[PDB]
UniProtKB/Swiss-Prot annotation, chain B:
Segments of this protein annotated with the region Receptor-binding motif: 1-49
Function: Attaches the virion to the cell membrane by interacting with host receptor, initiating the infection. The major receptor is host ACE2. When S2/S2' has been cleaved, binding to the receptor triggers direct fusion at the cell membrane. When S2/S2' has not been cleaved, binding to the receptor results in internalization of the virus by endocytosis using host TFRC and GRM2 and leading to fusion of the virion membrane with the host endosomal membrane. Alternatively, may use NRP1/NRP2 and integrin as entry receptors.
Mutation effect (L16Q): In strain: Omicron/BA.2.12.1
Region Immunodominant HLA epitope recognized by the CD8+, annotated ranges: 12-20
Span within the parent record: 437 to 485 of 1273
Gene: S
Name of this chain's protein: Spike protein S1
Record note on what altering T42K does: In strain: Delta/B.1.617.2, Omicron/BA.1, Omicron/BA.2, Omicron/BA.2.12.1, Omicron/BA.2.75, Omicron/BA.4, Omicron/BA.5, Omicron/BQ.1.1, Omicron/XBB.1.5, Omicron/EG.5.1
């Protein structure tokens, strides 16, 4: 999230066993990192190995 | 006041500001782009118009 110069990073890691699909389940997202940066952001890309 | 600290008799021209801009800004935002703003209805490119 990016609100008012503030970049919010929320996370959850889970061990699973599934090959392709998105499972049905429920677990909340704890906040992890706030960054007081201040950029206007319009696009984003992920990066692989 | 900072009159005796930085103001020179030749005119301290290091203190710049954005006077012309297309729109009002959101809170907590900064801008450093220096493109020539079409203050009139004619478009203008290059370095001046």
């Amino acid at each position: 999230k990016n609100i008012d110069g503030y970049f919010k990073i929320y996370s959850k890691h889970t061990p699973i066993n599934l090959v392709r699909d998105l499972p049905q389940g429920f677990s909340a997202l704890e906040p992890l990192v706030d960054l007081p940066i201040g950029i206007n952001i319009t696009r984003f890309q992920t990066l692989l190995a | 006041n900072s009159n005796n600290l930085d103001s020179k008799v030749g005119g301290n021209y290091n203190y710049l500001y954005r006077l012309f801009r297309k729109s009002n800004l959101k809170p907590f935002e900064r801008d450093i782009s220096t493109e020539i703003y079409q203050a009139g209805s004619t478009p203008c490119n290059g370095v001046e118009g």
